[PDB]
Amino acid sequence: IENNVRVVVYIRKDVEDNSQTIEKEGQTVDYHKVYDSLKNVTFSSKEEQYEKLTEIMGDNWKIFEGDANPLYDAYIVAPNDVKTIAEDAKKIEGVSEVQD
Amino acid sequence: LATDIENNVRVVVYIRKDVEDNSQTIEKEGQTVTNNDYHKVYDSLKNMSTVKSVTFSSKEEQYEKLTEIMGDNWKIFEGDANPLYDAYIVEANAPNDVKTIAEDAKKIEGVSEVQD
Ligand SMILES: CCCCCCCCCCCO[C@@H]1O[C@H](CO)[C@@H](O[C@H]2O[C@H](CO)[C@@H](O)[C@H](O)[C@H]2O)[C@H](O)[C@H]1O
Numbered sequence: 001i002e003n004n005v006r007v008v009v010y011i012r013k014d015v016e017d018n019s020q021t022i023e024k025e026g027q028t029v030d031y032h033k034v035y036d037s038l039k040n041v042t043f044s045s046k047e048e049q050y051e052k053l054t055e056i057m058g059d060n061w062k063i064f065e066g067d068a069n070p071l072y073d074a075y076i077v078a079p080n081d082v083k084t085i086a087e088d089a090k091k092i093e094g095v096s097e098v099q100d
Numbered sequence: 101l102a103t104d105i106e107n108n109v110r111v112v113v114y115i116r117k118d119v120e121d122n123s124q125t126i127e128k129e130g131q132t133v134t135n136n137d138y139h140k141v142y143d144s145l146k147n148m149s150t151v152k153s154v155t156f157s158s159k160e161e162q163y164e165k166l167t168e169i170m171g172d173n174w175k176i177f178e179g180d181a182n183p184l185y186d187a188y189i190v191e192a193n194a195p196n197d198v199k200t201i202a203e204d205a206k207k208i209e210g211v212s213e214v215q216d
Contacts, residue, residue, distance in 0.1 A: 062213065063212075063213045064183070066213075097176040099176065
């Protein structure tokens with residue numbers, strides 16, 4: 001991954017940029033314009049982030065299992081060419097935060 | 101004001117996120133009405149003979165303490181809903197009462213988890 005060339009872009013909790021079907025009603029359904037808007041790069045799920053967290057810190061966090069995942073879906077994305085797209089990435093609608 | 105109790109005598113009782121045990125009023129049908137379940141968890145804990153005190157710890161103050169321990173704000177979470185839990189810090193009368201208090205606390209309606 002490498003810190004030097006990496007930017008993290010967390011997407012808002014109320015946005016589903018990668019599940020095509022969206023069930024607000026009981027049935028099928030914004031989209032990929034998050035994805036390749038940064039292309040002009042890879043997706044990291046909140047559920048993977050949570051497994052990685054337990055892997056790093058030790059066993060489950062038993063007090064949270066019965067409730068929603070508080071982490072954010074994100075997209076993991078030259079050294080001097082960093083601060084730029086960081087600012088750029090906060091522009092996009094739906095994005096919660098970005099980190100450089 | 102700060103609470104001060106020994107580890108060997110403490111039980112943490114985590115409150116279900118949909119239970120407002122410490123709110124005297126809630127909104128029902130668009131009006132502010134008294135909360136009929138106010139202090140239901142508190143009262144079940146306080147009424148155990150083996151319990152010395154029961155102190156509310158809000159998720160807001162827990163977050164503040166978390167940043168005071170770990171440093172800085174967790175920037176990317178700020179503005180979003182606090183995922184920590186409201187809790188009661190329970191002080192047992194004696195260390196041998198802790199295991200019984202925990203099990204008994206788990207059964208209370210409105211309790212999400214307990215840590216002994
Ligand atoms: C699964 C792993 C668990 C990770 C847990 C993450 C760490 C806790 C994150 C909590 C961040 O959530 C944040 O909480 C605090 C207090 O509740 C709130 O920020 C606060 O700032 C001002 C003052 O600075 C307070 O007066 C006010 O109570 C609140 O808005 C904020 O509204 C919320 O956005």
